[PDB]
Amino acid sequence: SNIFKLQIDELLEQVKLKQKHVLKVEKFLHKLYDILQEIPDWEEKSLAEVDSFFKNKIVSVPFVDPKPIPQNTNYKFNYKKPDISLIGSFALKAGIYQPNGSSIDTLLTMPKELFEKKDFLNFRCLHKRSVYLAYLTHHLLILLKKDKLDSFLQLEYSYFDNDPLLPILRISCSKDYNFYKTRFSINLLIGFPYKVFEPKKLLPNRNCIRILPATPLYNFSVLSSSTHENYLKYLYKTKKQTESFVEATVLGRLWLQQRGFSSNMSHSGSLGGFGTFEFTILMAALLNGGGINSNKILLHGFSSYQLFKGVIKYLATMDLCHDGHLQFHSNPASKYIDEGFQTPTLFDKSTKVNILTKMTVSSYQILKEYAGETLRMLNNVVQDQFSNIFLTNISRFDNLKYDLCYDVQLPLGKYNNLETSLAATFGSMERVKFITLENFLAHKITNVARYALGDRIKYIQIEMVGQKSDFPITKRKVYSNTGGNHFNFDFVRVKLIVNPSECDKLVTKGPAHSETMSTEAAVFKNFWGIKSSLRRFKDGSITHCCVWSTSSSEPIISSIVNFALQKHVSKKAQISNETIKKFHNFLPLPNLPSSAKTSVLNLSSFFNLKKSFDDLYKIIFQMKLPLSVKSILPVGSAFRYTSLCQPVPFAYSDPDFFQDVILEFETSPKWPDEITSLEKAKTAFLLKIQEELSANSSTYRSFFSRDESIPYNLEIVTLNILTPEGYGFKFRVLTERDEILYLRAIANARNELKPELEATFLKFTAKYLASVRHTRTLENISHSYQFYSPVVRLFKRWLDTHLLLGHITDELAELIAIKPFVDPAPYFIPGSLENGFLKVLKFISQWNWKDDPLILDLVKPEERLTLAQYKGIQMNFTNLRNSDPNGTHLQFFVASKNDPSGILYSSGIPLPIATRLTALAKVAVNLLQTHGLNQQTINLLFTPGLKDYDFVVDLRTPIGLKSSCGILSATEFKNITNDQAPSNFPENLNDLSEKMDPTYQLVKYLNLKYKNSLILSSRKYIGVNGGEKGDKNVITGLIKPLFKGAHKFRVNLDCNVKPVDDENVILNKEAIFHEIAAFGNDMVINFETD
C-alpha cells in the first residue's frame, strides 16, 4: 500500500513543467483571438453567388455531404462575431509532452441571431457552418498573410474527431514567434448555441429528413456541437470542490492512449472514440452516486489511485451496451437504468444526450474487456506491475495488441460503379443513419462478422486504414484516389482476437429444424446461402450447420470470413492474409493421413504414442521382477507436446525420437553403496527387464545405450525399446538412493572441487527429479492454453535456424515460451500462432537480466505463487546476482513454483549465446516496427544470420532424411515419400548411426574439448532447417575474446598452440578446422574459414 504512489509521483515528474509551453502559446493564442476579435461581420449574401465569390478564390468551400444545391437552401446565411472561450485541455491541465502532439480547445459558439427554431434538420445548418468556416479561413488567411507570419504556420480543414459533420481549423507550426520544439496542431472549433429547442429533436429517436429511420448519430453530433459547456461547468465546479481530477485524468488519458483509445470515432472504422473528457464525465458522474440507489461510488477521501480503481471496477461490473447504462442529469442524482440500446450508452437527462455514442459496440466491448483485464492485474496484492499496466504502449503494433489481421481490398471503382462492384445496400434508410460509404460498409461488415463468427472469436475490431481527417484549403473534400475508389479509406483492417478453443472446430451450428421454418433458421439460410444445410449428428439432432474443410496452412476462420466478405459486401473484392500460411509451412508437416487437412491444434500423433506408451505400461506392469515397479513416469518432450517432429511412427531421424521415461522401484533398503555400483545395479535391472521383454513379448525389441548427459558417472546406461506400433522409448531407473549419494558426495568432496560437483547434482536434478513435475505441470496446463504446442514448436525451429539449441536446453526454451502465456498482461492470451510468437520475441527483446528475474506461475486462468514464496524467490535472485556481478556465467533466471532456485535450466549457456539471443530479439522487434509484416519479412526472420563469425562448415550425410524423419516435403504425391518412408524397423540396430546424424553430439564433444577457446553450434534439426532434400547442416564457431592474438605461452593456456615467437602462441586454425573435418571426413563436404 506504499510504493505505487511513488510510481505515481514519478509519472507526475515525467509529465509536468508545462509552463514553458503553456505560457508562450497562451500569449500566442491571445494574439490569435485578438485577431479573431478584430475580424468583423459579413452579412447575409446569397448561397448561389457566394459559390461564384469563392470560385476563383483559393478558398473553394468545404462541405458536409452532399453539397447544398440551391433548390432548398433558403436559410439565413449570416456571419457574426462569435463568443470566445479558452477551455478544455489547456484549461483543465492534462498535457503530456507527447512527440506526436497534444490538442487544444478554443470555443467559438454561434451567436443567437443566425438560426431559427427549426434550423436543426437536413444539415443545412451544417452547410452554414461549413461556409461560415470558409469565410473565416479566407478572412484569417488574408489577415495572417498581411501579418506575414505564414513562414511557419499552416492552416488546414480537418474534422472534429474524424466527423464529417463537424470540420475544424487546425494550425500546424514548423521551423521569436514560432512554436515547433514540441506538441502541434492548435485547432479552433465553432459550435452551436446553448439552449434552443425542447428535447424531442435532441432525443436519439429523431428523423425529420424525407421518407422514420431515426438519426441518433446526427442529433448527438449537433447536440455535442452545442452543449459541451454545461459539462465543463460541471468539471469546473467539481474542480473547485476537490483536486484529484487532474492527476486522475492524466493517468486515465495516459492509459487510454497506451490502449489506443483516443476520442476521435469508432463509427468511422478506427479503434478509439473513448477519451479523456469522457473519462472526466464518468468520474464526476460517479461522484454523486453511481449505484441503482445512487450509492456513492467515488469519494475524494481517497486519491487518484483508488479513484481509478473504483472507476475501472464500475466500468467492468456495470454494463452500458446491452443491459443497463448510467443515467445522470447535470441540472441531480445518477443511477443505473436497466436496458441497453445495442450501442455504448450513458444518458444525461439535462441534455438528453448519449455521450458514449462516438464509438461503436465492439469498441465498447473491447474497452470493457480492458477494464476487466487491468482490474484483474490491478487488484492483486502479489506483485507490482505498474510498468506492465501503464508504461508499455500496446498500441504500437497491430498483431501484438490483436491476434490476427485481415486486409480487405475492395476495388469498387466509383460511387456509381457501386451497384455492380459491391453487393451491399444502397438506400435512403442506410444513408440516413450512416454518414458515407465507409460508414455503411463498416457497420454492415461488423454486423456480418459478428453474426458469421458469434461463438467463434473473442472480439472483432474493424478499422479502415488509409483514412485521414486531412484535406487542404484549396480543396472541397478529401479529393484522393484511395486505390480503386475516392472514399476516405484505403483498405479494411479486420482485426480478430479469438476464443482459441473454437478456431478449428469445423462445424458451426444454427438453430434446429422445426417444420415451420422460423425466422432464425430463415436468416441463417439467407446469410449462408447454398452452403449450409441441416444435418444429422451422432446425437441424432437435426440442426442447421455447415462443413468447414480444415486445412493445415489455412485456419478456417479465414475461410469463413472470406465467404462472409465475398457473399455480402462485395463479389469481387479480395482478402489479404498471408502471414499465417507464411509460417505454417515453416511448421513441419508430418507424414500423417490427410495431414494437410489436419489442423495444427490436433494432437493425434501425441495421443498415438501415448496409446503405444500405455500398452507398454501395462505389459511392463503385468510382469514379475525381483523388485517390483513403484512407478514409471514419462518425461518426454512428446509427452509434454513440444517435440519438433509431430511424432509419426518409425521416425528415427529426429534425435528426440527416443522419448525418455523414468522408472523407479519401491524403497528397498538393499542397494549397493557407491555410485558406480548403484547405477550398475540399475543396469542389472534393465538387463532383467529387457531379458523378460524379449522372452515374453518379442514383438517389442530393445537395446542398451550409454548416456553421458550427467557428468562423471561413467557407467550409466539407458534401456531403449522399439514398440511395434512404431515408437522408441528410453528408460532410466531412478532410486531413492542417488539423491542422498550425490548430497554426501558434495559433502565429502575437496573444498576447491565443490561447485563442479554441485553442477553435476544440478544437472541430475534437472534431468531426473524436477523434470517430472515440470512435464506434469505444463502438460496439464497445455489443455488450457491451446496454442502452446504450436508456439513452442515454431520457437524451437526458429531457435535452431538461428543456431542456439547446442547450448540452450529445450525445457528452458519451453519456459521462455510459457512466459507470455501464464503472464500475458497487459495483452490477451494468444489466440493465434503469430500473436504468440511475436509476443514471445517482443517480451524477450524487452527483457533484461541485471535487474530482471523471471517469475512465472504455471497455473490455470481466472496453487498459485503467494507473497512469501515470491519474496523468497526474489531474495535468492537478489543475493544470487549480487554474488554474480553482471551475468559473467549466469545469464537468465527462470523461476517457477516447481523451482524456486531458478538456476536449474539457465546453467551452462555461454554469454555470447545469451547475448546473441537478446540481440536477435531486439533486431526482430526492430524489423517488426520498421518494415512491417511481409513474406520477405518472415523469410528474413528465418534467415540463418550466419554472420561469417570465423567459421562455416557445410555438412551432408550420404542420405536424405526427411522421408525418414516423417516430415513430408509438400510433394504432389504421397507415395513418393511413402516408398522412402521407413515403415519397418531395421533388423541390426547398429545402423541408426547412419540413418541419423552425428552432428549435435560431435559438436558437444568438440565444445567440451575447446570450452575456453571457441564455442560451436550445429543445426540439430537437420533438413528441418537444411532445405528440402534433408541433408544440409552447418558447423559454426565463435572465438573467445581472450584469443584475439598471440599470448604468452604457459602450461595452463590449454589450447591449440603455434609459437609465432619464443614467448607467444596462437591457434593453428587451419589445422584444427582440418581436424574437425577429419573427424567428420564422411560428414564434411565444404568448409569456409571466416
Binding site: 558406480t676 542398451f704 547398429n990 602450461v1051
Partner: protein
C-alpha cells in the same frame, strides 16, 4: 619462419602432417615435449606432451614411436598413455568420492618409459626432429593421422553387447558384494584398541569409513531463584526498580 623450434622452458615444438580435406590445399599440428621426474610410479622418466590430437590413444603412439625407432635408431619402451585427459570427463571421481575403496593437467598426455637412456635417446631424437622439421618441411619425421577416432566415435550409437556387459557387471557385483561383506564383518566383529577400549558400533552399520565420516560430520536447567546470592541480586532488582 620455422627455424624457431624450441621454447624457453625446455619445450620441444613437434609438428606433424595433416590429411587431405577435400577443400583444403598448411598442415601444422603442434605439440610440446619435456622430460620430468618424481620418485612415485607414475611420474619417473616421464614426458608431458601438450595440444593432443583428438583420441590420442595407445596404438598410434605405438606405431609412431616405432616409426621413430626404425627411422633414427632410438630405443623406446612404451607401455601406456598416462593420464590422457582430452575431453575432460575424469577429473573428479564420484565412485572414490563416496566409496569404501577403489579410492584415489589439461590436454597434457603423460608418457613414461622403462629406460631413462631410451627416453633420453628419444629426447635427443625429438630435438633433432624438431629442428629437421624447422629446416625442411618435406622430409618429415611423422606421426601420420591414423584414425581409431572413427572406431570409437562414429559408432557410438551401438548397442553395447549384451553378454559382455552381462558378465562385466556380473564380475563387478561379484567383487563388490565380496568386499562389502568383508568390510561389514570387519566392522562388527570385534574392535579392541591397542589398550582395552571396545569400540561402540551400530546394530546395522557397515564401514569404519562410514562411522569415521559421521563422527567427522558431528564435529539449560539453571534457576533464576533458589539461592541467597539470587535473593541478593533480586533485592538489588527490587530496590533499583
Amino acid at each position: 619462419i620455422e627455424d624457431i623450434s624450441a621454447m624457453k622452458n625446455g619445450f620441444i615444438v613437434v609438428p606433424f602432417k595433416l590429411p587431405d580435406h577435400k577443400a583444403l590445399p598448411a598442415s601444422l599440428h603442434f605439440m610440446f615435449a619435456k622430460r620430468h621426474q618424481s620418485s612415485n610410479s607414475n611420474e619417473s622418466d616421464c614426458l608431458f606432451l601438450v595440444n593432443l590430437p583428438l583420441l590420442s590413444n595407445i596404438e598410434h603412439m605405438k606405431k609412431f614411436v616405432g616409426q621413430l625407432c626404425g627411422k633414427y635408431d632410438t630405443v623406446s619402451h612404451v607401455e601406456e598413455l598416462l593420464y590422457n585427459d582430452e575431453f575432460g570427463l575424469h577429473e573428479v571421481d564420484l565412485s572414490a568420492l563416496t566409496s569404501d575403496l577403489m579410492s584415489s593437467p589439461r590436454n597434457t598426455a603423460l608418457l613414461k618409459f622403462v629406460d631413462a637412456a631410451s627416453i633420453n635417446n628419444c629426447w635427443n631424437a625429438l630435438k633433432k626432429y624438431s629442428n629437421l622439421h624447422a629446416k625442411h618441411p618435406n622430409e618429415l619425421f611423422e606421426w601420420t593421422y591414423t584414425t581409431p577416432s572413427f572406431t570409437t566415435f562414429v559408432n557410438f550409437y551401438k548397442p553395447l553387447d549384451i553378454d559382455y556387459l552381462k558378465e562385466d557387471i556380473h564380475t563387478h557385483m561379484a567383487i563388490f558384494e565380496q568386499r562389502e561383506a568383508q568390510a561389514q564383518e570387519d566392522v562388527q566383529s570385534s574392535i579392541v584398541d591397542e589398550d582395552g577400549f571396545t569400540l561402540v558400533v551400530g546394530k546395522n552399520t557397515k564401514s569404519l569409513n562410514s562411522i569415521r565420516k559421521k563422527i567427522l560430520n558431528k564435529n539449560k536447567k539453571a534457576k533464576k531463584d533458589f539461592y541467597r546470592f539470587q535473593v541478593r541480586e533480586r533485592k538489588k532488582q527490587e530496590i533499583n526498580q
